[PDB]
Amino acid sequence: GIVIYNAQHENLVKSWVDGFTKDTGIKVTLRNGGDSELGNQLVQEGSASPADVFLTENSPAMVLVDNAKLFAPLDAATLAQVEPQYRPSHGRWIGIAARSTVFVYNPAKLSDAQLPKSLLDLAKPEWKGRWAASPSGADFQAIVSALLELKGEKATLAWLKAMKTNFTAYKGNSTVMKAVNAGQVDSGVIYHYYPFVDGAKTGENSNNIKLYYFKHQDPGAFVSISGGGVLASSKHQQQAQAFIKWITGKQGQEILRTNNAFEYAVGVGAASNPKLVPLKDLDAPKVDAAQLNSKKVVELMTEAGLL
Fold first, then answer.
1. Could you tell me if 51 and 184 lie in one domain?
2. Are residues 127 and 187 in the same domain?
3. Cα separation of the two ends of the chain
4. Is 299 annotated as a binding residue?
5. Based on the domain organization, do 298 and 241 belong to the same domain?
6. Any known ligand binding at 45?
7. Cβ(142)–Cβ(98) under 8 Å?
8. The total number of structural domains that make up the chain
9. 3-state SS, residue 31
10. Which of 64, 148, 269, 296 gives the lowest tally of CB atoms within 10 Å of its CB?
11. 212 assigned binding-site residue
12. Is 9 annotated as a binding residue?
């Protein structure tokens, strides 16, 4: 069978593997990890990697591995399954799900009149002490990579230095959301699925929050694309290609609609969970995922004292 370096959520990937192995008989072994850890591991391993497939929560780790020339081109027939806006034009990896950047806030602590028009507003002195993020994670760093692509290094560094002044760090986005929910901090920049996931459980980490979507093609409206790719070094290319085709096809994408992960489907004609704001309604900025640069983000965030 196949080895998957899996940086996606385990519940989601377990569902996919369940369906895939049932339908194909192809066995799957997961090596679970984080986006940056597994991306770095693949670059280090290069052609010696045992990995057949790489799955990520966000795009910068896909771009990293792609820039290292480690991905096999995906079959055209697989690529056609996913909307063009959720796959890089070069076709060496594919979107498998998406998540929206969101501003979570506690309406008891932050007035609606005071909601920011732009992610860039969070740099202003008016925002000092009011917002939280989890800077150590691939999730937030992918938002920063989008900011970098959209606005350039100078504007991005300036925003990051201001963030150092203004923001409060928590370890993990669910932690950020819990803090906001408890009123320990007024607001936070996370991804949209957190309160939905919590709502499907006990709801007690999310019962006091609301979500605000930046929209208007702002960097804060960034839709982060989860990626799937087949390693060029794979001994099982046919099976690896089949896995990516399966998860980006109807069987893979319907699971995104029905499960408790609340991440968006990216398949052509694929509906997402009915609780979610439709993707088209978010008015996300056009961001070339292949241009996203996790190394430069780490460099700039380190310069700003965030890492």
1. no
2. yes
3. 39
4. no
5. no
6. no
7. no
8. 2
9. strand
10. 269
11. no
12. yes
